[PDB]
Design an enzyme around this catalytic site. Sequence first.
Site, PDB file in Angstrom:
ATOM      1  N   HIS B  59      39.530  30.073  43.261  1.00 31.49           N
ATOM      2  CA  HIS B  59      39.794  28.641  43.097  1.00 31.49           C
ATOM      3  C   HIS B  59      40.932  28.079  43.937  1.00 31.49           C
ATOM      4  CE1 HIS B  59      43.258  29.988  40.819  1.00 31.49           C
ATOM      5  NE2 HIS B  59      43.676  28.736  40.760  1.00 31.49           N
ATOM      6  N   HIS B  61      44.087  25.317  43.618  1.00 33.13           N
ATOM      7  CA  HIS B  61      44.862  24.510  42.685  1.00 33.13           C
ATOM      8  C   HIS B  61      45.813  23.713  43.560  1.00 33.13           C
ATOM      9  CE1 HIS B  61      48.011  24.097  39.206  1.00 33.13           C
ATOM     10  NE2 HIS B  61      47.529  22.939  39.622  1.00 33.13           N
ATOM     11  N   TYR B 120      63.666  -0.646  36.938  1.00 28.91           N
ATOM     12  CA  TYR B 120      62.667  -1.359  37.722  1.00 28.91           C
ATOM     13  C   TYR B 120      62.558  -2.802  37.235  1.00 28.91           C
ATOM     14  CZ  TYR B 120      58.262  -3.232  39.287  1.00 28.91           C
ATOM     15  OH  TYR B 120      57.350  -4.090  39.850  1.00 28.91           O
ATOM     16  N   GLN B 124      63.665  -6.168  39.422  1.00 29.62           N
ATOM     17  CA  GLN B 124      62.710  -7.214  39.771  1.00 29.62           C
ATOM     18  C   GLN B 124      63.226  -8.595  39.376  1.00 29.62           C
ATOM     19  OE1 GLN B 124      60.112  -6.422  41.842  1.00 29.62           O
ATOM     20  NE2 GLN B 124      61.321  -4.536  41.702  1.00 29.62           N
TER      21      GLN B 124
HETATM   22 MN    MN Z   1      47.841  27.220  39.330  1.00 32.24          MN
END
Ligand code: MN
Lengths: 130, 130
Positions: B59, B61, B120, B124
């Site tokens: 796999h 990842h 944030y 603003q």
């Molecule tokens: Mn992993």
Amino acid sequence: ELKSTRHTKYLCNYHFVWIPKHRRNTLVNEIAEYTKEVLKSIAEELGCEIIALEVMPDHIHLFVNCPPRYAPSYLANYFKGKSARLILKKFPQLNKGKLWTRSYFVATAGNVSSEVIKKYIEEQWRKEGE
Amino acid sequence: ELKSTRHTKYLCNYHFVWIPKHRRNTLVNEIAEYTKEVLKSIAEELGCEIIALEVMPDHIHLFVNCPPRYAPSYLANYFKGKSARLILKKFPQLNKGKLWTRSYFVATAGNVSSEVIKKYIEEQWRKEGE
Ligand SMILES: [Mn+2]
Ligand SMILES: [Mn+2]
């Protein structure tokens, strides 16, 4: 929880935060109630599940679980753009320019365990074969 | 760390996991090496920052930080689609059928603090005015 689509297992949670343009006591009373209603309506339209929604006088904090076909920017602009059109159309005393500013904050959320990843891999091999 | 664009402050991290089609011993040696190189090139191409990349025999990842303009599905399919093309080209023995399956796993990652969000919001309003 983890959700599944055609060929997909996913968990996509996002925090979306933005503020009303110039008045800090805009999203209140009936305006705030209608704002929550339309944001919920838009979420449903996009197949998104709202985890938490806060419509405060000076900002909106939308925490939502969404399908992987959507980009964070696409989602933010859909929620902000469509909600503004509806809110301004509903309350004339606004309608003086833009409801929101052109900025927004987005942050992914989640803590994938290695066991969940391991399991997905084992499942795909079990399904596909070797 | 949080990043920013034109009009967005963002933190978009995703875990992408997918497996090769019935070859559970092909992503090794030169093929594994090239696969890692290609995935890194694709990330750079898209403006994404790889946090961690694992190319294992069974796999892939991919843990990556990406611009908010991209949908998780677009990223998964672009990373898989383009790497497959490049890999099959360099290793013709893999030209038989599809390199990857049509499935993939994706999970958002992050634990943003209230302080970052609060900052944030205040920034603003400081920029916008009231
Ligand atoms: Mn992993
Ligand atoms: Mn909040």
